[PDB]
1-aminocyclopropane-1-carboxylate oxidase 2 (Arabidopsis thaliana), 1480 residues
Amino acid sequence: KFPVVDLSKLNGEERDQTMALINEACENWGFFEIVNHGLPHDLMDKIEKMTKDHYKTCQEQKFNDMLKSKGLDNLETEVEDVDWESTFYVRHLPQSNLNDISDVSDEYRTAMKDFGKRLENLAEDLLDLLCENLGLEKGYLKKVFHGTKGPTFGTKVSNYPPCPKPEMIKGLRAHTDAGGIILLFQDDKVSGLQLLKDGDWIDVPPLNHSIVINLGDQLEVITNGKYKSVLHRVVTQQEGNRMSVASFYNPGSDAEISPATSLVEKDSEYPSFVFDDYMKLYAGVKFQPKEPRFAAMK
Amino acid sequence: KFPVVDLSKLNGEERDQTMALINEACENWGFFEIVNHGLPHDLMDKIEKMTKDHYKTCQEQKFNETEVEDVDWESTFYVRHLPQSNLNDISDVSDEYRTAMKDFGKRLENLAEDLLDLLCENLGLEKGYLKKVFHGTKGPTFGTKVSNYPPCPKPEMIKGLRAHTDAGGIILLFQDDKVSGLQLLKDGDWIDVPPLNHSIVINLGDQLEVITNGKYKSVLHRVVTQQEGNRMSVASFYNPGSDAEISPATSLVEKDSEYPSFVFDDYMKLYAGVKFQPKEPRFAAMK
Amino acid sequence: KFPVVDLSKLNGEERDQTMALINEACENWGFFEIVNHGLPHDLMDKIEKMTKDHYKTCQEQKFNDMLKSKGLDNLETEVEDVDWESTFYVRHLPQSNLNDISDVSDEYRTAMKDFGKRLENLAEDLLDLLCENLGLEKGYLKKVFHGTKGPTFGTKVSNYPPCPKPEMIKGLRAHTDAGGIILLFQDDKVSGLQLLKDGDWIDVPPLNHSIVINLGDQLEVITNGKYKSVLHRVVTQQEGNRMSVASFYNPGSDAEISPATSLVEKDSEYPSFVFDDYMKLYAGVKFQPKEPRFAAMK
Amino acid sequence: MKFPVVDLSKLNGEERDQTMALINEACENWGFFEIVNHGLPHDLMDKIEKMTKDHYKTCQEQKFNDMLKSKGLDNLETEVEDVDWESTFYVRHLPQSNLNDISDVSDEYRTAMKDFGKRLENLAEDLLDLLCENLGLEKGYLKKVFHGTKGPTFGTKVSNYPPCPKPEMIKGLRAHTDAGGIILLFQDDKVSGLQLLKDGDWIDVPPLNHSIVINLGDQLEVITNGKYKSVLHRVVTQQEGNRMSVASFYNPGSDAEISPATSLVEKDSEYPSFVFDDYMKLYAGVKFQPKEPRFAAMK
Amino acid sequence: KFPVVDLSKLNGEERDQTMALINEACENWGFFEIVNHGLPHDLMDKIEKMTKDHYKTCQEQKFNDMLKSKGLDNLETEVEDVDWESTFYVRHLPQSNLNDISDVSDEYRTAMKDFGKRLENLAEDLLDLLCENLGLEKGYLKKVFHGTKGPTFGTKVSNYPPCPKPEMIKGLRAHTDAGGIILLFQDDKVSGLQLLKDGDWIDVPPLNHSIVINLGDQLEVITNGKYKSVLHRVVTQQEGNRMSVASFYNPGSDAEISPATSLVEKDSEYPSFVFDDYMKLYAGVKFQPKEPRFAAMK
Ligand SMILES: O=C(O)c1ccccn1
Ligand SMILES: O=C(O)c1ccccn1
Ligand SMILES: O=C(O)c1ccccn1
Ligand SMILES: O=C(O)c1ccccn1
Ligand SMILES: O=C(O)c1ccccn1
Ligand SMILES: [Zn+2]
Ligand SMILES: [Zn+2]
Ligand SMILES: [Zn+2]
Ligand SMILES: [Zn+2]
Ligand SMILES: [Zn+2]
């Protein structure tokens, strides 16, 4: 059963049990859903509606332009080198480009700014729960992530349109995320996101007004492997356009990333590096195995 | 006019003038300061902070009447980065200091190689030539000497470090930005290497004098003490590998060279015993 | 782009450009940094070393005993009524108390006296540049500031020690300065001082051997609002102790302060008052809005 | 992208700051603006307009048709880029008035023109003082700069743009920037035609009853060190409609020294320092060529 | 310092800095000289000799004829409506008229043909360097320029003979060029060509065996203003006849010109049009301001 965490149970004497659920999702799933997370359901509903309307208005034509430009009109053999995906990226931190994206509406930009700020505070709240579960001092992960200019925080807004031949192409090929903590607002009707657990692909179930959390490669390093970043993918379907609004809380470019000493006894197998060196490498090898990227930092 | 090179001026119309200043420093100064070098000022501030605080906790107590010309008024420990790091084996260094030194050392190694490629361009050598010469079998040798020069009641009796030339390739110095002391010998005068915030001091060692057939000479330098003030020094040495073959680059030689061809580790074995004696007998000894 | 004025550029016709830059900073920034100001760099280096050593020797434990008496160990909630600040004050004029600060060395007292005299001369040179830019006669501002016993001149020696939770407390809360012209020798590594400009907090960047200049409330009155006194604050940080040696060149206590008539066309909105009445009021309301203090002098 | 209209009566009251800020925005971003409630009597504007239009019909229209005949512009077979489809005469007010020397004007027109020009000269100097305040200059700075030895130069160009059968072949007045200081235009309130270039589009300066159109010339671009630029403008023709134009030019005296104001120059200016009459002698010959070479020619 | 680019440094490890110089000249100068290009120095020397000998035998007559019918033998005052210039035009593409110019020699035509082909290939190589510097796809600008019949490529062969009173008339009045990329073989002793930069006329220095490159109006549109076409002129002198062999690589007549979408964020201020409509208009208004010609294409 996929972990669903009720964050409102942290405000009372059920808080220890909630923390234990968070910790075991972090150790064994790499993913969990959160409900009662404090984000207004009214804000999620308009983010959802304006994301979908901005797709028809602005992204659908770019998407078909892409399928023509790569011959994906007609899928007669398996395509393992492209994602059946429509995306644009919004940067929040350290410097916002929200007011420079030309094709987004005023009210969409205002909703995205509010949504991004609330998710940034929720990311930092979640990192503190991780710290507590890890036996780290409060604020430890936030301070590691800061670097010189503060954390990097952006939002990937994706749609995975219907695919006539889902067997032939993935919406997004299997990978682990490079960063710190990932907070996903996904479609509540159209499924597609899957994680790999114990040798099976497991669906990340659509759930109304929920946020999906998962941990990236940097948290595997800092926890000395105690919390691993898990492989995940998006599969297409013939009917349905799955919406994806995923926010990435990453260390600053010059943050020093290393295994926390209190989590290391035997010499660590994980490297110590500067985050931007990891991200330069990751961009070119995102869909290749994760383990060579750690070795490359030594 | 001590040369200060602005590395941000390399991308542009003004790059020819920046390169000419670098070349002119290499030929006639043997030293130059670089600013806007790409190293984060917050990493330098941490390095300086932890270096000075590591002195007071670990070295200052341990550190505790006529001319003394055979001793250096100096407190030092050494960190090895390449070919193989001993950073996790220096006992008296803290985790934050060790993590900062690893990051700082990696950035200085990349900056050293960028500087070697600027030298190559000014010398008319192909890019990567000096890096390739320095590699040997195991790669270049790269380490950092962390020094403090504490106050001396009688500075005219003892030097912080006696006059010498450096044996190796290129030296990248992060020095105190308030307390002076480092001097180079130029045209028969001792010249101060001026403290400058968030700068790196570059100087060339004996190996680059050989490879350039004397076009860039390694210059004598020293550290003088002072009565008040503890000058910090974080100096990184980018050296050829032990079995690198060092010889004058053929394109810089027309008339037969006066400089020898040798293997770097034979020069270093010799250098250790005669570091404060004249440089010129060390070149002759390699023939 | 924060104004940095090179005082060596007064010696040509760059002088017009330099004067125009000073005027622009006075009108729109309220702050500017000066370089090549004539203060010996070796005297500044001594002042800094001795201030930092006097903090460690005399104030750091005194400071730590204060956070116990005021419960600032645990910053579990926001503190808006205290400054995370260690200070003492040195009065130079009209009457010196330099020989009464008990825990300072002969050599610190002798250096501070020399430093103070040089800053007093630089303050008066700067006031004459303001006079020229305003079209006032030479010495106009010095004469207004004189009163009967001469200007008031003192130095505030501050350190802002590291704060575990900088989000909770300011090093010094937002305020404008009551006085005439303020000449600040600040830490050249540790930032923290910010001014408010166009609705944003802007850092006053550390710059080695520079002096930071800002204008106080009295100059806003004399210029009939042409040069306004700008809000500024000091923020803390988690690792770094920012030093501040700030000298205040203020009118004499019984000086008559009023808008210079040549700067007044329409009847002024600013009061005419005696400086000590302004200062007696300011002491109690320093971190409250500035504008009621002008109204209270009518 | 609304054309700026400034209510000058709002300077007399609590909204003076907001009005000054609007004027400053128009000076930086449009180079043109319309003013209303400007103090010129609406009945004097009506008489000027009536007498200008009747003087065209009785005295200028025959000359205009005869001008085309002599240049063969009866037949707009192809584009004309070197002629203005324009009927004009010029009235000099300062430093020396020639009003009593124009032969074909009535005494009533001459008296109204003298009264109109005097009020416009006073309004020009009032506006220059608003610019001074917005620029941080001393009161009267621009008037003092413009004075030279004999005072400012002030004249009025009285133009009509008669109907043109083929407007796409010829402009009423080709694109240019004005050489001088501040230009105060009383234009037709029905017939449009004046356009300015803004952000790569021609923008109509909309006819507005009893308004005055203000624009800034090349000399104020120099003095403000480029903060207020002189903007390109033109007059287009139409097939029917005769647009009237009464435009007054407040210019520095001939021997006035023009340079960027010292308080606006924090680094070396790209703009020259020169004597105004040298700029004008050059401008007369290259008025419809680019502006920027004229600044370079003064160095 | 006027930009001089060594094109042989593109074949090696200095190529990035060479590209950076090209991009800098394109953004800030609109002009640059190239050395070590592909053109044999003996071909340039022969083009220069035969151009100058063709002036004396064939063009000097037409030039004095011109001065006759325009009354320009004696220059009492400024002439602002004519150029002190002797020209004939050679068309190469889409169709050559080289074998139809009656007064050109066999060997001049053969040299002119070889010269034109090498400059056409150098124009296309240079356009690809601009593409790379602009982040456009390889061949992008050549494809835009093609239309139906291919690019237009021609050569303007000019001489600017000595003028007794150079103050009175220009060799060629200030203008921007209408087309794509302009490749000039100019006199290496007699100067005269100037560009306008930062409010100053700057000489384009004569240099042995060099080619002067500048960008026309079409590249400003396609780059959305990132590379502007800059005003330039030729001044006369009393002693000296400056030679000018200028080759113009322009889009085909029916090419669609518009800002490249990857260079546009906010709505472009530049029009989208068909090139021949721009050229029809330009011919009549060449020496009037540039900006109204862009406005006219909307
Ligand atoms: O696009 C991704 O890589 C993604 C999106 C949401 C959650 C995890 N990963
Ligand atoms: O210790 C040395 O020999 C040294 C240190 C820094 C720079 C140059 N030389
Ligand atoms: O303590 C203050 O109020 C202060 C200090 C330095 C500069 C400005 N203001
Ligand atoms: O005739 C002109 O040049 C003019 C007329 C009115 C307004 C601006 N310019
Ligand atoms: O004749 C021209 O317009 C020209 C000639 C060469 C270079 C630029 N422009
Ligand atoms: Zn992912
Ligand atoms: Zn050394
Ligand atoms: Zn203050
Ligand atoms: Zn005009
Ligand atoms: Zn041209």
Notes: The longest helix of chain A spans residues 41-69. Residues E 156, 172, 177, 182, 184, 214, 232, 244, 246 surround pyridine-2-carboxylic acid (ligand 5) (CB under 6 Å). The two ends of chain A are 38 Å apart (CA to CA). Chain A touches chain E through two residues (CB under 8 Å).
